[PDB]
Design a protein around this ligand. Structure first.
Ligand SMILES: [Zn+2]
Length: 489
């Protein structure tokens, strides 16, 4: 019980204290501590806070594991640690951490910037691949703001939810933002089909439904910004076919879980994952239905022309994309929600355009690139460890391609036998090696020997714990490039 002798090593200034982490609650003072390579909670005083925190005692001092339990307790006393919504009228960034250790660095990039962090952000996919739960995602976010004294507030976004089970769960754990992914009710068939065929599939709809869209939309012209959107029969029928059922999904969920939720929630609707790129006029029609039914949209995340792959920059004609971007953006302003950029990390070619055309009102989601900067550190710090996992990613690539859409050319990665140790980090500058390391993250983390220990993960977390100020330095730099290119003041 007395290995809490650690506290005396702290008395002498022989443990790292986290400067901004002191915060009181009535009689108790709580500050955060790394000691022997473990972060700790350290409190002295008296009151409902001290008594509720779990820990070993010694003095009027307690040493608490950074636990889910103790953060629920910190949630009860310290409200900045609790997630919070921000609204559609502001600049936000999603800061995905698939590891639970990118928080503090994420916090240190936003302090001083005119942007709101969505510190906790994972998709259901990432919880599966990594084997984590949503309690953990909030834990790291809430301990990151505490550890760094970021009290200006942060968000928890359940990302890419599709099953109703997931929405209830994310609701239950206090996620303040919800991302309904509907890329899968998109009739990708009707989008490629021919004029005489859409009409066939469209005339197979109820009169009431067909009378609806035609009265509301047909042959009329909508002045968005300096942007006229017009619907002939050929276009209306296609978009109704292509998007109808997905529109119906959004409205059902808004009514069932979002608006009955009892607290503020950001409702992001997402279709960036479709195969059908979201045509601007199509975008107009989906919001116009959502809004005319009094859905309260935080943000739309469409499928832009060209392709947004994981870990790499835009693929397409950037001139065309700007022309699509201007109208999307104009659509989101007339309606008053924001455009949400998925797969946004490393899309350096789109950032100024996004910033300008949205006058700073946008959502940009990063996640894997943070796992990639941690991979950079191993390459910089544990060459052998990186070699061991660079090779395992190789032999399990085609596996992981069942879960992300990437056109990686395996034939652009210099063989491991060919790059010196100090040349390892430069892989994390390269398109193909980046994508290789990007999507294989679930296999690496879950890798076990037939002994059942972690093949990689535990050794990986120790070096990351050891070169922490490095990791955080990388995030500050890589994520800053992003925010400066976006024009965050
Ligand atoms: Zn996404």
């Amino acid at each position: 019980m007395k290995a809490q002798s650690i506290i005396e090593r702290l008395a002498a200034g022989q443990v790292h204290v986290y400067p901004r982490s002191r915060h009181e609650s009535e009689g108790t003072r709580v500050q955060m501590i790394k000691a022997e390579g473990r972060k700790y909670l350290v409190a002295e005083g008296s009151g409902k806070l001290y008594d509720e925190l779990r820990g070993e005692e010694a003095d009027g001092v307690k040493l608490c594991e950074l636990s889910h339990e103790n953060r629920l307790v910190l949630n009860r006393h310290f409200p900045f640690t609790v997630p919070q919504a921000f609204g559609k009228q502001s600049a936000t960034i999603g800061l995905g951490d698939r590891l639970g250790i990118a928080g503090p660095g994420h916090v240190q990039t936003v302090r001083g910037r005119a942007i709101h962090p969505i510190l906790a952000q994972q998709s259901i996919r990432e919880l599966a691949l990594t084997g984590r739960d949503y309690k953990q995602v909030i834990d790291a976010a809430a301990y990151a703001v505490f550890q760094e004294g970021y009290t200006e507030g942060y968000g928890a976004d359940g990302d890419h939810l599709k099953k109703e089970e997931d929405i209830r769960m994310a609701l239950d754990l206090g996620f303040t933002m919800l991302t309904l992914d509907c890329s899968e009710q998109i009739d990708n068939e009707a989008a490629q089909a021919g004029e005489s065929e859409v009409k066939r599939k469209y005339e197979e709809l109820p009169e009431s439904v067909r009378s609806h869209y035609e009265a509301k939309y047909l042959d009329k012209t909508f002045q968005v910004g300096p942007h006229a959107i017009h619907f002939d029969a050929a276009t209306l029928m296609r978009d109704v076919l292509v998007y109808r059922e997905a529109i119906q999904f959004m409205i059902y969920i808004y009514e069932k879980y979002i608006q009955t939720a009892g607290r503020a929630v950001d409702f992001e609707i997402s279709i960036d994952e479709t195969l059908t790129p979201t045509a601007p006029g199509s975008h107009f029609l989906v919001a116009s239905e959502l809004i005319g039914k009094n859905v309260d949209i935080f943000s739309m995340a469409p499928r832009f022309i060209g392709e947004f792959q994981k870990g790499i920059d835009y693929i397409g004609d950037i001139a065309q994309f700007e022309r699509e971007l201007a109208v999307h953006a104009a659509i989101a302003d007339r309606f008053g929600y924001k455009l949400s950029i998925h797969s946004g990390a490393d899309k350096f070619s789109v950032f100024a355009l996004v910033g300008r055309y949205t006058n700073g009102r946008f959502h940009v989601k990063t996640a894997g690139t943070n796992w990639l900067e941690a991979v950079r550190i191993v390459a910089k710090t544990n060459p052998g460890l990186y070699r061991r996992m660079h090779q395992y990613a190789l032999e399990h690539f085609e596996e992981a391609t069942a879960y992300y859409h990437v056109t990686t050319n395996l034939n652009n990665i210099r063989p491991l036998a060919d790059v010196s140790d100090e040349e390892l980090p430069s892989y994390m500058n390269e398109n193909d090696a980046r994508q290789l390391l990007h999507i294989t993250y679930g296999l690496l983390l879950q890798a076990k020997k037939d002994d059942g220990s972690s093949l990689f993960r535990d050794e990986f977390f120790r070096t990351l714990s050891e070169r922490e100020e490095d990791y955080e330095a990388a995030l500050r730099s890589h994520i800053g490039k992003h925010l400066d290119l976006l024009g965050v003041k």
